[PDB]
Structures are given as C-alpha cells and as structure tokens.
Amino acid sequence: KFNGLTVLPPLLTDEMIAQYTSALLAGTITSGWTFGAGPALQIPFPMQMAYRFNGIGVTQNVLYENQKLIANQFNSAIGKIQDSLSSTPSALGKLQD
Amino acid sequence: NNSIAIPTNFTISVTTEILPVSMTKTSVDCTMYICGDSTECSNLLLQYGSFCTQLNRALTGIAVEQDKNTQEVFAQVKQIYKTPPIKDFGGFNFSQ
Amino acid sequence: NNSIAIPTNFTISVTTEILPVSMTKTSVDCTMYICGDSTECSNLLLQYGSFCTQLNRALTGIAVEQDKNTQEVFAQVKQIYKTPPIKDFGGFNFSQILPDPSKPSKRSPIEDLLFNKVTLQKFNGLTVLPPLLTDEMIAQYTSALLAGTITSGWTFGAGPALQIPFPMQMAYRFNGIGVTQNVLYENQKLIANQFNSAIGKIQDSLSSTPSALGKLQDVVNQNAQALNTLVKQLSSNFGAISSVLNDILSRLDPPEAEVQIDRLITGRLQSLQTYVTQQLIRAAEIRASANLAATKMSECVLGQSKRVDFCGKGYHLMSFPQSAPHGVVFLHVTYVPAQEKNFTTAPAICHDGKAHFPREGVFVSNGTHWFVTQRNFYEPQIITTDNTFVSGNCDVVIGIVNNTVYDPLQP
Amino acid sequence: GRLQSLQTYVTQQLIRAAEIRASANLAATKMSECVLGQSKRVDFCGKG
Amino acid sequence: VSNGTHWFVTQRNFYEPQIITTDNTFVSGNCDVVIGIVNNTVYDPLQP
Amino acid sequence: RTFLLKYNENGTITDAVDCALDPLSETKCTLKSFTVEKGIYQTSNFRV
Amino acid sequence: QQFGRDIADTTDAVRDPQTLEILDITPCSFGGVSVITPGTNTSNQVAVLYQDVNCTEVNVFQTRAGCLIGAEHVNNSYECDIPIGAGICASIIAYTMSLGAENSVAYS
Ligand SMILES: *[C@@H]1O[C@H](CO)[C@@H](O)[C@H](O)[C@H]1NC(C)=O
Ligand SMILES: *[C@@H]1O[C@H](CO)[C@@H](O)[C@H](O)[C@H]1NC(C)=O
C-alpha cells in the first residue's frame, strides 16, 4: 500500500471464478453443448464424444470400437498436460507478463 | 492426380491456451498523489481544473471494464451445474 | 451412462442485441478552441508546431472511421430489395419489423420505438459533422436487408437473390440446426404463432425496460460529457491569472502576457490532447463494436450461424436487423428446446450379431420399445436399415442392447 | 511534472486495458465456441 | 422442384433434377399435418 | 502572401502556387503537393 | 442578474444597460471550408463546401452539411465518388447517394 494508490478487490473472487469454471466443466461433461444452447440435456459422455466425432467428420462407430484406446489416450494427454504445465517455466508467462 | 493419403489411426491431443481476462483494478487519487496532504498545492491544482477528475473517471472505467471482462468470460451459464457424484464417464478420467 | 434427455417440444424465441456502430462525428479547431480570436495567441501556438494539426487530423480520421463503420455495418447489400406487396409468409407476421407506409420516415414500429426510447455543443469552435448515411437511408438499408432475409433467406447474401417460400426457408433453417424439415411443416401454425408472439413481446420488452437502449445512450452521453468537459476546461486557469484570454492580453504587458498566454496554451493544448486521445480510445472501442456488428450482420442476418451464442442464446435460426441512433439492434430468432423426456439410450443395437448405429439422431427406449429419433426433437421412428448403418459386431461396443432392425425389402 | 506522469500512466493503463479487453473478448469467444459448443473453425480451439 | 409438368428432387445450389425416390426422400407422419403439400408418385427403386 | 514553391534537383524554383489565389491553390498548399487526388479536403475556416 | 451563463461556462445572454432588455449572444457563424475536387489531373474545376454555414455568407446548394457552391444539385442519384456528408455525394454535380440498385424479389 503506497501514497495515493489502492487496489480494488475484484468483484468475482477466485473461489467464485473457480465455481464458475466447475459449473462449465460439469455442464460440458454431462450435457455436452446442449447446456450452452438451453436446458442441460444429460447425455452419456461416450455418446457426446461420438457426436463430437461425427461433428469432425469421423463416424461415431470409430470411437465406440476404440472407446478404451480413446479413453487411454485422453487420460494420458490430461496427465501429460499437468506435467507439461508444471515442468515448463513461462508456460503461464502471458498472465505473469 | 490419382493418389490420396488416408489416416488409419488417430491421436487425441490436449493443448493449453492461456488467455488473460483481467488486470489489477488499481485506483489512484489525483489530489493525494500529486499534492501530498497540503492545501496550497490543491489550490494550485484547482487552476488546472478537471484533468485528474477525468483521470479518476478513466481509472474507474478501466476497473469497471475489468469486472465486466471477467464476468463476460466466466459467467456464461445461467445455472451452476454440479458434477454427478459417480465418475462413470466410460473410462474418461476427469479427476485432474 | 444409458439415459438421454430429448425435448418433445420447442420454443421460437427472439432476443434483442443492441450494438453501437458509430458516434457523433465531432471536430475542433487549433485557434477557435486553444486560442480564440487572437493573432498573438495563434503566433505563440505556431511555436508549438503542428500539434493542433495532428489533433485535427486525428479527429478527421475518427470522423471518417465512423462513416466507414456505418457503411461497413449497413451497406452489405449490393441492391435494395423490396418486400412483396402481399404478406403471404405462411402465417409469419413481420409488420412489427417491416417499414410501414403510414410512417413518413418509413420506419418499422420496433425501429420507431427504438428512436423514441433514446433522448437527445457547437458554439465554442466545435463542429458536429452530419453522418454520411441519413436516418432514412440507414432505415432503407435495414428494410432492404429485412426484405432480402424474408424473401431469399441467405441466398441474397451469397449472391443473386433466389425467391424462397418463407415457411420452406424456415424449414431449411430448422434443418440447418439438426432438426428435420418435417417438424416445422407438421407444426407450422404453432411456430408462426410462437414467432408472432415473440415479435410482439419484443416491443413490450423494449418499451417497458428502462436502460434497454442504454448501450447506445451510454456512448451518446460519454461523447456529450467529453465535449462538456472540454469546453468547461476553457473556464480553467491552469495557473494563469485569469481563464479569459482577452482580459489578460489587454491588462498585461507583452513580456509577461506571453508567459501567461503560453501557460494557458499549454493547459488548453493538454486538455485538447487528452480529449482527442480519449476520443481515439472510445473510437477504437466503437470500431471494435462496429466490426462485431458487421460480423453479426454477415453471420446472423446475411446467413445462418452455427457458432452458439454468437447470435443469441439457443440454436440460432435467423435474425432481423433494425436501425438505431448510431447503432444497430439485432432481433435474433432462435430455436430453444422445450419440455424434454429422458429415454433409456444405447450406443448401438445388436441384431443378427451385427452392431447397428443410427445414421442420424440416437436410439431411445420409452420402456418397452426402441426407436431412432433426432436429438433436438422427440420424433420416434421404428428402427430400420434406412436410418441405421451396420459396422462390426456386438462384442466391441461397451453399451449394446438387443432389438430387431426392420428392412423394408424383407416384407 | 507529476500530473503529466499521472496522465502518462493513465494513458498506458488505458492502452493496456484495451489490449486486455481484446484478450478477454477472444477468451469469451473461445469459451462460447470451444467450451459451450464445438467449433468447426480451424486452430480457433487448438491444433487438429 | 416443379418445372411445370413433373416434380423432381434437386440440390438447392445447383439445378440437377432427379425423380422422387425412397432413397433421396424420407417419410415422416402423414399428409394431414404438413401445410401446403402436393400429391406425386414416389418411385420405389425396389418395386420394379 | 503564403507561397508553395516547387524546387527541382538543380534547386531552381520551377513552379509556384499562391495559397490565397483560389480554393484549388489553397488545397494544393494544405496538402503540401501541387497535384491533389480526388477527394474532400478541409483547408481553412470561414468565420464572419 | 446582469449576464446569463449557459452550461459549461458560456456567455449565452446579457441584460443591456439603459434598456434592461435581455439579449441572447449567439456566436458569430464559423465553419471549416472543404474543397470538392475530382483531382487536378482530371480537372481544375473546384467546388467549395462551408461546413455548418447557412447560404447567407459569401451555382449554390444548401445541405445539412452546410452551404456548397460550384456544384450543380441533380435530382437523380448515383453511386458516391466524393464524400460531402448528410447523405450527399458529388462539371461537378452534387447528388443524394444511391445506396444500391432497387431489386424486388418476386416472392411466392
Ligand atoms: C493406434 O495408435 C494407438 C496409440 O496411439 C495404438 O495403441 C493402437 O493400437 C493403434 N491402432 C491401430 C489400428 O494401429
Ligand atoms: C483417475 O486417476 C487418478 C490418479 O491417476 C485415480 O486416483 C482415479 O481413480 C482415476 N479415476 C478413476 C475413475 O478411476
């Protein structure tokens, strides 16, 4: 705190921002994109992933025949992301800047 | 003209994109900052006029804009959705 | 893991999106503001060089930028399209959004309400250049866009306007969001009634909510406040013996009057530069808003947008443009899912050792029978080889249920 | 001198705030078209 | 589309008329719900 | 009078423009160029 | 009260001595002078636009943008080539801009 300087606290606290991110994650995992368009329509996550595959031009059978491999790749990528974000300095450099 | 390459397999990758949404809401009072606890400097400042009330308004606009930026980026959901108690996602792991 | 929720109904909602596209094209002068009618003051200003020329050039640039913003946002049609004389649109009502002959300014009731919702300087060397596109001409551009959308869908945006039946255009817009065309035709009267009711509610929402037009009034007030503070800064002394230039020039000898005049010129030029810089920042904000409005006019009005929330909450069907003072109001007609029911769902169905997956929509079970239905509307259909495709066996899919697939060739 | 310094700091903050607003607008568009939905636009939500 | 004597099914962005068949058209509901429809023969390829 | 003089590579004044002669010459003086392209140009201010 | 002040410290009015009448002081007419030119290469012909000036201070045409001389006002509209303002664009002829050719689609 200096002479003539003050820092107003943000209206949204980090915990409330984390609650917003948690709500968005819950909606994306449970209702896919339906919660964005309107009421949250529950859908099995493999079925939502299959429709996203259909959306990117790959038939939904491709995920179902490879559901275990796809889940294994997804888990490996998510775990690798934490390691990449922890072992790489300046990865959050944009916020630090 | 008669050859195409078609992928027989795929990799599901995850990419991290970091985007700043807000900055520190710093407020500076002109009368305290340029004229420290003295009246005569404040009287000399009043000849300058609305320069620093304009500066205070600009800082206030920046702070309000930062609050609006954070709200627009994160408050895109009318209701707070809650994750199901069981993590039965067909083998996808979201614990991280 | 085996339950889906599918809406058995839908609602046609209309959302108002107000975007400022321009501001008052204000401009100031080197001497009439900084100096007044004083030759000695102008000679002292000339020692500061082309500072005021830079300020005037910047203000001229922002005025031309406001003109360009309006032209880019509204002039997106090569030719003015005129609505057909008869309003045979399959029940859909556009009287609230089409221009009316009774109004001389040729403005739709929503547009006229928008102008009457907002409420509205040039005596101290200031000037407010008139906009290149007048109120009537911006309204004519908006009317042309409305006629093009209601008569050709998005084909007029792509190129030559192709005549389209509006119920059929709305049916293909329904097909565009993953809902089969038949659902609109079976429910055309219900959709038209919902559409008309939402359009009627739009007038009530605009006229009964204060600050609804605040996004435009805010910029208008900010420009007015900036001009008011700039002309109030002339009353400031900036440490000089008096704010008025004439009296201090008259009552002071040349070698101290010039010092006082220089102090006033430094203060007034700093005020003008601060105002010009703040106007440039506000012009950048309005330029971004106008770019967003032009992008919304191209994606939502000139066509159908598949990016969610870009043209209002819900599945965007189409939209209407409306003129507003220094702004545009978009009436986004969107499809929102309605009462929904959960259904036991399976990723694939095992028949004769073969896994069948739905070509479109998903498999659902109401308890005893399985059907294939579109995701956005509950229209159950008997499982057939026509709407399902077979790949692999039943031992690979994690979720498999047993049901009979009916191929019409066998009966 | 101090008022000129404060005006400069306010101007620098305003330009930085505009850049942060542009970043936040991009983040909101990414949240809508990548998280709330699926984007067909290439490289808007990552490679691939 | 109807050129004035016969009905056909064509892509919207190019005029390539084709006979109405069961493979390019899907049946939904009945004729007493859809508004503004006309009668025609849907040639079933399997029938001949 | 204010005059816009065009110097050549030798340094001789090959051409001149009288700013107060007529609005076109005043426009040439304002743009600091003998040839002006099609467009609107604010040159000075008329006040009574 | 001897003189009237409008918002932002402007001398809007003053009561005169020996008459007590209140006289409104409207600032003397002032405005920028814009030059309409097709380019010196094309032609030396020039039109003059006095911004926010009534056609009462020295072919003429009075527009919302001000008093424009040297260009003939023409009723029929063309695509804009030189900007003037107030929906008007510009021998030199001044015309109201035509936003686009009229095309009514035969809806059915
Ligand atoms: C595809 O690649 C994955 C590793 O990313 C591997 O486990 C899998 O066996 C591969 N499948 C085929 C068909 O090559
Ligand atoms: C996800 O991984 C974590 C740690 O690797 C593990 O504790 C957890 O059980 C996993 N999730 C499930 C559903 O097994």
Author numbering:
A (entry chain B): 854 to 950
B (entry chain B): 709 to 804
C (entry chain C): 709 to 828, 853 to 1143
D (entry chain B): 999 to 1046
E (entry chain A): 1096 to 1143
F (entry chain A): 273 to 320
G (entry chain A): 563 to 620, 641 to 672, 691 to 708
What did the authors write?
The spike protein of the SARS-CoV-2 binds to human angiotensin-converting enzyme 2 (ACE2) through the receptor-binding domain (RBD) and changes the conformation to fuse the viral and cell membranes, mediating viral entry. Here, we used a structure-guided strategy to engineer an inhibitor peptide with mutation-tolerant and potent binding ability against all SARS-CoV-2 variants. We named the peptide CeSPIACE (COVID-19 eliminative Short-Peptide Inhibiting ACE2 binding). For engineering, we determined approximately 2 Å-resolution crystal structures of CeSPIACE or its intermediate-stage peptides complexed with the RBDs of several strains, including WT, Alpha, Delta, BA.2, BA.5, or XBB.1.5.
